[PDB]
Amino acid sequence: PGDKICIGYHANNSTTQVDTLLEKNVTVTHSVELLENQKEKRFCKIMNKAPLDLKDCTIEGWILGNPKCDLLLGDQSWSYIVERPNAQNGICYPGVLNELEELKAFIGSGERVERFEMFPKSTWAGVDTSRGVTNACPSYTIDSSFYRNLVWIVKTDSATYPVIKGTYNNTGTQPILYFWGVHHPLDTTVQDNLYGSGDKYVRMGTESMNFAKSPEIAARPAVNDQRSRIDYYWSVLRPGETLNVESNGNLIAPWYAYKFVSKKGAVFKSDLPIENCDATCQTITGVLRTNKTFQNVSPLWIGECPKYVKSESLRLATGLRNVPQ
Amino acid sequence: GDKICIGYHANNSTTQVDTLLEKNVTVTHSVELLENQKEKRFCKIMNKAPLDLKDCTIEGWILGNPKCDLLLGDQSWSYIVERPNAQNGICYPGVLNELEELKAFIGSGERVERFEMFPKSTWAGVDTSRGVTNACPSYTIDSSFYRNLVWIVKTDSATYPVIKGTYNNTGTQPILYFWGVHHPLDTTVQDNLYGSGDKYVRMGTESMNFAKSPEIAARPAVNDQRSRIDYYWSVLRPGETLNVESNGNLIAPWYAYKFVSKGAVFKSDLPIENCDATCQTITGVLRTNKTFQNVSPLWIGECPKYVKSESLRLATGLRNVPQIA
Amino acid sequence: PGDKICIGYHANNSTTQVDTLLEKNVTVTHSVELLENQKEKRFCKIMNKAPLDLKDCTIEGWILGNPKCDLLLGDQSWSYIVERPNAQNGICYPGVLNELEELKAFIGSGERVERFEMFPKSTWAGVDTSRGVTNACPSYTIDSSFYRNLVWIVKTDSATYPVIKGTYNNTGTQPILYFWGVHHPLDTTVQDNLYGSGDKYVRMGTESMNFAKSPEIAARPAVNDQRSRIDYYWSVLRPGETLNVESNGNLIAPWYAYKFVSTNKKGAVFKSDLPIENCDATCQTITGVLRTNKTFQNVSPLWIGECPKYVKSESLRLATGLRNVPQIAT
Amino acid sequence: GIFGAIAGFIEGGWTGMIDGWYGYHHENSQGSGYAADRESTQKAIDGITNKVNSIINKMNTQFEAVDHEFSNLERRIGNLNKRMEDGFLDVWTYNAELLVLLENERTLDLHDANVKNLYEKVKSQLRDNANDLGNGCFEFWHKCDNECMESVKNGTYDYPKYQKESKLNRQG
Amino acid sequence: GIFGAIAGFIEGGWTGMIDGWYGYHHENSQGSGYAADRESTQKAIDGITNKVNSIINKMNTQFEAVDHEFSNLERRIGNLNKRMEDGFLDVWTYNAELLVLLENERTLDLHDANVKNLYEKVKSQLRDNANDLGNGCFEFWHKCDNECMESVKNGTYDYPKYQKESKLNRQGI
Amino acid sequence: GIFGAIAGFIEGGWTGMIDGWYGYHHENSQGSGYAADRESTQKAIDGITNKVNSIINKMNTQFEAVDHEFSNLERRIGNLNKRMEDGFLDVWTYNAELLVLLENERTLDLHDANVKNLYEKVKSQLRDNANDLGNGCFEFWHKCDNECMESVKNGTYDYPKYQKESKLNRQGI
Ligand SMILES: *[C@@H]1O[C@H](CO)[C@@H](O)[C@H](O)[C@H]1NC(C)=O
Ligand SMILES: *[C@@H]1O[C@H](CO)[C@@H](O)[C@H](O)[C@H]1NC(C)=O
Ligand SMILES: *[C@@H]1O[C@H](CO)[C@@H](O)[C@H](O)[C@H]1NC(C)=O
Ligand SMILES: *[C@@H]1O[C@H](CO)[C@@H](O)[C@H](O)[C@H]1NC(C)=O
Known part of the structure; x- marks a missing residue:
């Protein structure tokens, strides 16, 4: 019956998940993928x-x-x-x-x-x-x-x-x-x-x-x-x-x-x-055209490429744990 | 009058871990991740x-x-x-x-x-x-x-x-x-x-x-x-x-x-x-489930990672503060 | 007036800053520089x-x-x-x-x-x-x-x-x-x-x-x-x-x-x-003598003797004190 | 959650609060709705953005494999190169993956702290003019106006102004 | 401890509470006991087990040193191989040792927070129907049933139901 | 700050409190002053010094580059040496820089927690015998003299002793 004010946090339709040391597959409101797995198969x-x-x-x-x-x-x-x-x-x-x-x-x-x-x-x-x-x-x-x-x-x-x-x-x-x-x-x-x-x-x-x-x-x-x-x-x-x-x-x-x-x-x-392509990062298996910091494409390249790692995904959480109602 | 109290677990554990803040901290449960033991044979x-x-x-x-x-x-x-x-x-x-x-x-x-x-x-x-x-x-x-x-x-x-x-x-x-x-x-x-x-x-x-x-x-x-x-x-x-x-x-x-x-x-x-091993180092066999070993860098088979560490004990439990008596 | 007790923290004149993952340029009361950049240009x-x-x-x-x-x-x-x-x-x-x-x-x-x-x-x-x-x-x-x-x-x-x-x-x-x-x-x-x-x-x-x-x-x-x-x-x-x-x-x-x-050395x-x-050194790099306590050095990766670890860093200052929020004097 | 607010004493989030990370839900005779706390939200964005850019910047060097050839009398240095390149490959893969797991845990805790700190910021304004329920919600002992609500959100809530009215109902 | 509960405003652990990490101790006319709070305990176990498995998994690659020989005309490449192998050894030894010191610190904080949060959960329910003794202990201003104790633990405690009884006691004193 | 005390609900630091990191500022009829809270300050100093020494001990191996020469038929092994040495240099530069950024965030948080816990510690002793002004400051509902002040600081404050005096003053306003 009394008036109310409540403290709370954002939720949204995100189904994107991250892993943490404590927990795997945590759905999170906002996140960024730091790894690039896509390439143009050409020189x-x-x-x-x-x-x-x-x-x-x-x-x-x-x-x-x-x-x-x-x-x-x-x-x-x-x-x-x-x-x-x-x-x-x-x-x-x-x-x-x-x-x-x-x-x-x-x-x-x-x-x-x-x-x-x-x-x-x-x-x-x-x-x-x-x-x-x-x-x-x-x-x-x-x-x-x-x-x-x-x-x-x-x-x-x-x-x-x-x-x-x-x-x-x-x-x-x-x-x-x-x-x-x-x-x-x-x-x-x-x-x-x-x-x-x-x-x-x-x-x-x-x-x-x-x-x-x-x-x-x-x-x-x-x-x-x-x-x-x-x-x-x-x-x-x-x-x-x-x-x-x-x-x-x-x-x-x-x-x-x-x-x-x-x-x-x-x-x-x-x-x-x-x-008749142009590019900035050329890999032995293809071009990387990306802003991402990591790539799982190849360790062999010429140009300014991201850093090669064996990882499939490197998603940093930025928003918070997604718990919609 | 009636009491409800909130608290934590204690036990007779005397095993300690070190922390960046503190050394020799006794904890209720912990895991040793390093193997320092070997069978001295091939x-x-x-x-x-x-x-x-x-x-x-x-x-x-x-x-x-x-x-x-x-x-x-x-x-x-x-x-x-x-x-x-x-x-x-x-x-x-x-x-x-x-x-x-x-x-x-x-x-x-x-x-x-x-x-x-x-x-x-x-x-x-x-x-x-x-x-x-x-x-x-x-x-x-x-x-x-x-x-x-x-x-x-x-x-x-x-x-x-x-x-x-x-x-x-x-x-x-x-x-x-x-x-x-x-x-x-x-x-x-x-x-x-x-x-x-x-x-x-x-x-x-x-x-x-x-x-x-x-x-x-x-x-x-x-x-x-x-x-x-x-x-x-x-x-x-x-x-x-x-x-x-x-x-x-x-x-x-x-x-x-x-x-x-x-x-x-x-x-x-x-x-x-006349023995079988899954991990063999130049100074001996490792029969272990541990992640790390300080026995040898030189081996054959599937062996844990070699490091110079004496122990790598991860606290899993909390600080152990059992009652005195 | 009524009797007051207040809970608070230290502040001082320090203008020395540190960076963190969340924030750059944080002025702190106490800190340690872990990186050495000074050398004596001699052997x-x-x-x-x-x-x-x-x-x-x-x-x-x-x-x-x-x-x-x-x-x-x-x-x-x-x-x-x-x-x-x-x-x-x-x-x-x-x-x-x-x-x-x-x-x-x-x-x-x-x-x-x-x-x-x-x-x-x-x-x-x-x-x-x-x-x-x-x-x-x-x-x-x-x-x-x-x-x-x-x-x-x-x-x-x-x-x-x-x-x-x-x-x-x-x-x-x-x-x-x-x-x-x-x-x-x-x-x-x-x-x-x-x-x-x-x-x-x-x-x-x-x-x-x-x-x-x-x-x-x-x-x-x-x-x-x-x-x-x-x-x-x-x-x-x-x-x-x-x-x-x-x-x-x-x-x-x-x-x-x-x-x-x-030689063992x-x-x-x-x-x-x-x-x-006619001088004595413990750390001798190719571009000079290091005479230091510090953990890290940006002077050279080539040396003989006991030297701090070489890194490309300009500074490695660890905060030890807290955020320094001194009163505005005016 | 570690600060215990997110997925904790505040059980769920608000699909309705669209314009911020952390915020307020109010109900009163004039209606009900959501409003983001712009200052703590922006300061978290600022912090998270800086963390992401610190991580990118520190990861901005590359190890470079080369594909030099080695002869049939060069198995040792050929294999030295391979173990070398694969060695740095393994270190950086480890550095990236662990850092992501760790920072992801710490970032969820930051958001939790931010929500918890906002809860406490309101609590200390309202004092006894309102009842702290389980769930991050406060039930007023007086009638809280849209201005009244706005004032709580501004940090300018007037506690004496409602003290007598709220004593009444808090007793009655 | 950083959240201040463990070895803090709650001075000691309970050897008597054997079935969980975090929990409740209660005393009322019916009896007294140590009962763990299962949910907080189980989440902490799941979290910690996951941290241990993640670390083990992230650490499951080996650098492999080799047995190769070098001639008297191969001092440079022999030394190259030695500095390389020692180099990776120094890097991994650092990664493991620093990671353990760091994670042990954070693990203790997580336990500390879980206790602190359980305590705040009870304190907000009880309000002035209970009195805070030190050491994470509350003294009810009213008779608190076993059923009443269960209600405090599972978060369903009825502050209105015991309010009149509590006020009469709190200031008759 | 993350625990919300430093540069938070307590807006500023005290240049006046010379002998500690965290502490009290008091005012009463006898006088006004600053005193460090010795116990919390010393534990933080111990903890921070351990952190610093741990980092120094873990960082106390060196990779060693070498001044070997390579001939014009040694481009591949010369480059191998260079990529190897640069590789360890990049890894170590990364380890030190990242570590400092992370630990600096965590060190600032620990300080924030110690202040918040000290404030929470006083707040629980005082109960409603004092009024919360803003800025981590309590105004007593009774006369609190130096022994009373020291009392709060020591953790030995007597809520019953003042409850009657505090109750009358609270009603009168
Ligand atoms: C999810 O949200 C975005 C923005 O609100 C919207 O454009 C999109 O249609 C939604 N996605 C679904 C569930 O289809
Ligand atoms: C601090 O800020 C100044 C200007 O904001 C900048 O030049 C410097 O790189 C920053 N970092 C530190 C730790 O001083
Ligand atoms: C070198 O000296 C030792 C001692 O005189 C001797 O036995 C040996 O035969 C010498 N070598 C030759 C080839 O004479
Ligand atoms: C080749 O030409 C240059 C300049 O004309 C001269 O200095 C050099 O002696 C010549 N080399 C020889 C040895 O023929």
Whole structure:
């Protein structure tokens, strides 16, 4: 009968719940989800820069200049690299690209390369630079070809393979990434026919680096019909450094190389499509377009992404326990 | 007059917890979350016994040191136990190259199957029977060699010709195999055992290359040898082929292991006993329901989290204030 | 008037604030700053042990015995090493010191070394010990000189460089840190001139180690007026071990070496231009001495000694008192 | 609830009180309704918002996995990297999940405290001019006007002004 | 204790109340007893059990140290692995030890509040029909039945029913 | 504040009460003053000092970075070291900053509770022998001299002794 005033709290139609240390599944009036579990299954530009799609070429195929990787050939700037899992064009002539993992780490990243002719074929005197092709390395148009960045130097028809020599003096601002090889024949017969007779060496040097290799002749199991191998090498010529090359034979010479410009770099091994999308956070499994602080999508990303956790949900209560009547 | 009073529970508990505000607070109920107790032995994990290497190291076992015959053929293990004082390892002095990486690869395995990879008949016109040393006795014979290798020597006439071998994996499992290069102390031993001239060991697969030639010098005597053997190991992938070519100084692969791939290697003097465990640490078995343990970071199976804490007791009850009397 | 008793709390003049989850800038009566941001921009003794000052020499210049580095020539003891970023005196004769990072890590930790003559010049027979000095490696006094810990052996006026052998047996209880080299001439000419004709080798071995190398002959870009190179190497001869040395030619022989004591103390190498003074420290960071009670520090994550935990934080002030709500004085 | 008001001596909340977290329900001859206490509600919003932004801000760094490659002679460092990346992954997953559970418990207690403090703020105004029932409700011993009610909510309730009338009925 | 009840204005616990955490002690002409309040007790058990299970669950991942060997040319990566493994160990040891100290403090506060709230529940029902002795005890100004005691406990106590009896006693005194 | 006392129903602090955190301000015919409540202040000091020392003890391990060099063929392990060291630095920075924010909130609340409990303690002794003015202040319905004041502070206040005097004064107004 008397007038009344009561103290109370808000209630609403919320069915959203949180967990606490004391209690699970507590329906609460207002809450925020701090975790993002959704993604765009594609690759987008980052900082408005396109990624490099290596297509049917592996990283080895692209930077050695495998003849089937011509579409990649010659100048490139990238926000990150996409390498397709089933890409078939890599090292066409069998052999080992030495310090491969460390090369992959250097290239990624890495934001641009400028391809230039480091050693003109004219560099090597008294030898044939026009015949170093192989059926192992076909282009799309011709059955026997070779890497675009190397010259497989061979004996002139008449006479022995002389001492050949080359120098490149890095005069620019940028480090240069370059490649070379040593050929290891199947046979002493292949050795004699290609290079002359006698003990062969490949020696390279810079102000800070020393290389020396001689052929190791033996038959290895056939790969791309080749029982011979090439040991491939890479290095980086710093600004102001000079490279000296000197070989007796078996040299697979540096021909083209890369001015290399260097943040967070990324090589994504994925088959996802690269679309005319733009983005801020790119994950190996997709774009995150979110304001949330956590994500359960991937620990591998480029850009400004939220923090990866294994959690399915991270809902903070903000309002209070919901107890409607 | 009549009383109603409001109050709390007390009991004879003398167990205490610490708090950020207060230390040594007696509470009616509490839970210890940490296990500090262990069985000081090795047990089976998943009803699978560990492999006791006994008086052999991992090198002695896997190269087949003649005193490790115990220990020959197939092995299946939940984990490996290597005794700290094992004296039978590399009997003929030299380095097992990439030793740490071999130990980690063996640790990854759960089973090996021993089989004859290269029969002695493989190597034409050389002597398979002679290669034994006083550096490698068995318990019965004063001069013997590794069970898994053949120290090939030239025949009596005698000239050491080029010898070649191939094994094509043909199988579902990776093969772990071994070889060596003999480095004689003398020009005299070199000529006695192997013939005349520069000598080589060359091996290759689709993915791998090896080339080595003897380095001839006297080294400090170890087990009476001033010579050395350089030992090598590799894994032949399923579908891969191995080519072996030598004209001298080859310590040939003979027997190899089909390898079945957490797993661990425990260096401990603890006894293996006829018991089962679900959690095994390097210092012993944990039979516990507890969340934490201060026994060891190194274990196999399902173990509670390792921390340096002496106790982690969570109050569940309230402050215990029982009446005095 | 009527008699009053009031329940209340303390307030004071404090203007010091703290943050909390619910509210920033809360002025409180009492608080503790748990984070230290002050340092002394200098290097001090840690265990009453002075650090080693390499001065104008790098770590390579020091242990190879670069002639310009004689000031550091004798025995050395240190609690840590300070290497000046601009030291000019390192590898004077151009070449690579192989496994350099792993050598620097070995020298850090790091308690002290005793210099001694491991292989006397007499060890090598039929070869000339005296010749090998280069303009590339001057001492401060002499224009042509060589590393103090190495002998650049050359062929005598004889046509031949004979096989030479050297042995050293460690009977000593301390590991010995020692160095050697292989010389790569730019020339077949220089190769002939300095050493015998024909195939050349450097071989060395211990109970646990084998080394073989032969010269790699080519012209390299000039460094210190040298297109030739030397491959430098280092190793540690364990107590009870023996080292055997054999060479055809091109051997830069071990001459002086170091007995090495490892240390219980964490070992550190600091690349810094900061001064070293006659002062004592308990906490030494690369950018300075910490002299503090505090739990936390934002000065550096690199230190030797006992230091507070490093964090990126500017301040970590814990409230201990309550909210400070003093009366408005007007 | 810990302060015992929410889901406690005040059994349920008010779907009817739409414009605040904590508030008043009144009944008198002129009618009945709901009104949020704007000051305590805003101060809670301010507090909760600051907590949420403190949590976001402290969680604003990232561990970065890299997908470097490792060779068949690099199993040890390959596996070192994995245990390393998975190690930070496990720590942060733990930090986030525990923090959410803990802060969620503490936030429900804050709301509870706020309601309880408002209850006590009214109680101390009304004194004996009203009867404290079980449930956060006060039954006046006098006639409480819409201004009267407004005054209770304002903290400007005039206790002497109704003291005599309420003594009467409190006795009668 | 922070709510002030436990080891506070209620000085001691009851060894006699064995069937719950929080409860009532009553004395009337019919008898005297210790009876736990089941609802507050059971919610506290559910809450605490949940806290223990949440902590156990959140802590059920292990960092796994390894047995790998390092050569004399691998001092840097060997030390890297050691600082890494020690680092995670220091982090988890910290997480566990600090969490226990913190949660033990908050757990005691929760018990303290549950007692304090039960006490306020009774005090608001009784009003001036009872007199507050110290120590969380109320003396009724009227005869209080067993049925009357049950009514105070289950919250159905009738203040009007005993009001006239109470006032006569309270000031006859 | 959360218990509602500090910067709450008690609006301000006392610069005058020099010897304690929490306490009393009294006025009577004899005089006026401030006295700290010793027992509550000392227990809070003990509790806060334990909290601070606990945090310092738990925070007393260090991760150690190392000055190792890495060559140009060591980009992967060099970066591994860097991400590892930065990783522990970020975890520890998070632990310290978050902990301080949380504990600072909880420390302020504990102080708020101790004030509210002290006030509640006096309020229950006094009963209706005093009148509640605002701001945690009671005006007595009787003469309360220094022994009477100390009486409230000590917890030994005699409600019966003054009930008759307080009752007459209360009616007269
Ligand atoms: C819940 O509330 C929102 C806002 O009052 C309203 O728009 C929505 O229709 C309601 N949801 C339901 C129960 O359909
Ligand atoms: C390369 O060119 C730069 C500048 O022209 C010069 O200073 C440097 O000596 C050259 N390097 C060599 C050794 O040829
Ligand atoms: C080294 O010294 C010990 C003691 O003289 C000796 O027994 C050992 O044979 C030595 N090593 C060699 C290879 O002579
Ligand atoms: C306090 O507030 C000032 C201005 O509001 C701000 O600059 C500072 O970062 C805040 N934090 C502390 C603890 O002072």
